Amino acid sequence: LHKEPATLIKAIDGDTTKLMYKGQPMTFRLLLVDTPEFNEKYGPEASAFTKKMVENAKKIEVEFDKGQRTDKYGRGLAYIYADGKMTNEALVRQGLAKVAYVYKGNNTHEQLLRKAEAQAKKEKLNIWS
Numbered sequence: 001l002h003k004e005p006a007t008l009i010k011a012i013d014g015d016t017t018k019l020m021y022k023g024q025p026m027t028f029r030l031l032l033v034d035t036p037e038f039n040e041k042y043g044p045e046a047s048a049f050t051k052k053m054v055e056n057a058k059k060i061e062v063e064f065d066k067g068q069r070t071d072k073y074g075r076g077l078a079y080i081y082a083d084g085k086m087t088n089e090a091l092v093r094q095g096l097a098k099v100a101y102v103y104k105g106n107n108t109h110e111q112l113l114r115k116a117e118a119q120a121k122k123e124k125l126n127i128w129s
């Protein structure tokens with residue numbers, strides 16, 4: 001897998017963000033995770049966490065997996081990095097997202113993320129509290 005450049009256009013919620021990629025605005029949905037909707041418990045905290053991570057970064061990058069790159073809603077499917085740190089993993093490690101939506105063929109970072117979810121659950125963080 002390869003990292004590619006992108007720039008923030010605006011935050012949306014814990015697991016979606018609007019980025020400019022190859023010069024075109026696209027909403028990205030984070031691979032392999034599910035944050036609560038803004039309305040649900042920890043929804044606001046997930047949104048805040050992602051918003052802060054992405055806007056504070058100097059360098060945003062997107063990394064597509066081996067399979068489909070856009071979902072049925074036209075959202076890009078990627079791992080998103082903020083100054084070299086993976087947002088998807090960070091959300092799971094903090095107990096602000098569950099590993100979810102693991103489709104065969106777009107699952108390269110599955111067991112990195114499961115390792116993070118185990119450690120969040122062990123610490124009883126947020127969703128696991």
Ligand SMILES: Cc1cn([C@H]2C[C@H](OP(=O)(O)O)[C@@H](COP(=O)(O)O)O2)c(=O)[nH]c1=O
Nearest residue numbers: 029030031032033034071072077101103106
């Ligand atoms: C993360 C991800 C979501 N999706 C689709 C499945 C779900 O369809 P449904 O909309 O029919 O439930 C929806 C979940 O996204 P959200 O959690 O953003 O709602 O997006 C994919 O197709 N591929 C993916 O990799």
Ligand SMILES: [Ca+2]
Nearest residue numbers: 015034035037
């Ligand atoms: Ca969600």
